[PDB]
Structure formats: structure tokens, C-alpha cells
Design a protein around this ligand. Structure first.
Ligand SMILES: OC[C@H]1O[C@H](O)[C@H](O)[C@@H](O)[C@@H]1O
Lengths: 140, 142
């Protein structure tokens, strides 16, 4: 669809530009691996979960294989899929920052050893200082 | 808008950006496009449909559509909420750069205006500033 856009922002939208793919990815980062685990987490219709998972596998974000004991089938993040972590954190932080009323609460992403919330993910310059959007440009 | 009442902070934003085009309209906004005709020539998206996605970014508070201060046309401008997408945008661009191009393929680069020089890869970091792997985090009901 955008697969032959020259744009690095557009190509990935073919894979993650939908209402569910990043939530399957969120769940995989939380340790879910089985089709039925995803279905019950997402509440998503089986055939529709099937299509989103199929697409993630076709795009090399996940690999579906048999479990070690051969007792069932699992889906795991590839290196390409694990690389979605910064994007996932950015989506989470933007949701935290803009999508909840003052009286609502939500889960937090925390350091395993700390329990301390993971800090805001910032764009930084080569010197390590905070870099604002207006101090960048896109070059051909 | 089917994640509107989800408890999850990842899910609620997908109502807004979980599609093939929203983040490209936002891409263009960061590049200084503000007029309907500019987005249309940039995106090659059918006009009526571009119009719908724009009106929907406005409804979700990512942009506003205001009369141009001199003249007879409307301008689309990022709000604070919309400008706050820049990290997310960089993250998408870099994942696209890392995994979506043949080694033979060229593409545009995000660079520092002063020096630039490609903007450094994003990095999830711990409180102490050190790189933090997904496996070193967890999701907590605090
Ligand atoms: O990342 C967790 C926290 O970070 C920021 O302060 C958000 O705006 C806040 O609401 C959220 O709970």
C-alpha cells in the first residue's frame, strides 16, 4: 500500500497503522504468546485477530512457531518486532499525557528493579541535549 | 473511536493515529504544510477523504482549522497535543529506516538544523540515563 512510498514514516504504517497491531505488540511485550491469550486480552473477534496476526507475521514483526514441548503454538516478536519498543513507549506516553481526564487512573510502565516509572522518552541532539521539532528538518 | 474508554494508555491514541494516513498528515505539518491544497499534492490522497482525516484530527485535538490571518482560506495548525507527537513520529521514522528499506535504497533523513547531521536514534532510558531494554521494564497497577 505504502510499500513503495519512498517515505520511512509511510512504509511502517502498512504494518502498524491500524487500531490493533500495536496492542498485539504491547501484549507480546507483556509476555502473551498464544492466539487465545491475545483474543481474551483484546476482546477482538477471532477472524479479525487472525488477520492482524497474519499481517504481523507476513511483515516479519512476529514469528509463529510451536512451543518447545509441542503442546501448543506461540507467536513471538522478531528482532524487527522487539525494535518497536521505543515507538510503543512514545504511544503510551502520548496517551498518558493527552487521553485521560484528571480523575482517571491507568497502569504505569516502570523499571522492573525500581518499580520507578520509566522517564519521558525525548528526542536528543548529537550532544545529548533535548532537541525540539523546530530545530530539525527533513533533508532529501 | 473504539478505544475511547479502554483503560490502556497505548490503546486510546490508536483511535487517532492507528490508520494509514494520520501520521503522514502530521509528518507534513512538521514540515510546514498548513493548507488543504498542500496536503493534497503531498499525500496524493483523494480529496474528499483527505478532508475527512483532517476534520478528524481536528476533532481529536491534534490540529485546529483556523481562517488565515490575511486572506480567504483556512489553515491547519498543530496544537500543543499535536506538536507533542514529535517523539512518536521520530520513533516511526527510525523503525521505518531500520527495517523497511533495501540496503540499496535511499530515503530522506531527519537532521539537526544547526549542524545536521542525522538526529540520533531514540533510546528508552532508565531514571539514571542508561539504555533500558523492554525486558527490564514491566507494566504496573502501581
Ligand atoms: O509516564 C507516566 C506519567 O507521566 C506524565 O507525567 C503524564 O502526563 C502522566 O499523566 C503520566 O501518568
Amino acid at each position: 500500500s505504502h510499500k513503495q512510498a519512498s517515505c520511512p514514516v509511510a512504509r511502517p504504517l502498512d504494518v502498524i497503522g491500524d487500531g490493533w497491531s500495536m496492542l498485539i505488540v504491547r501484549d507480546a511485550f507483556e509476555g502473551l504468546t498464544r492466539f487465545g491469550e491475545f483474543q481474551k486480552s483484546l476482546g477482538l473477534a477471532k477472524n479479525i485477530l487472525a488477520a492482524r496476526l497474519r499481517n504481523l507475521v507476513e511483515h516479519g514483526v512476529m514469528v509463529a512457531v510451536p512451543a518447545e514441548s509441542g503442546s501448543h503454538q506461540e507467536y513471538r516478536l522478531t528482532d524487527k518486532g522487539r525494535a518497536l519498543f521505543p515507538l510503543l513507549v512514545a504511544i503510551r506516553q502520548w496517551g498518558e499525557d493527552y487521553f485521560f481526564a484528571p480523575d482517571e487512573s491507568h497502569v504505569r510502565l516502570v523499571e522492573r528493579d525500581s518499580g520507578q516509572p520509566v522517564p519521558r522518552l525525548q528526542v536528543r541532539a548529537g550532544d545529548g541535549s533535548p532537541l525540539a521539532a523546530e530545530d530539525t528538518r527533513v533533508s532529501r
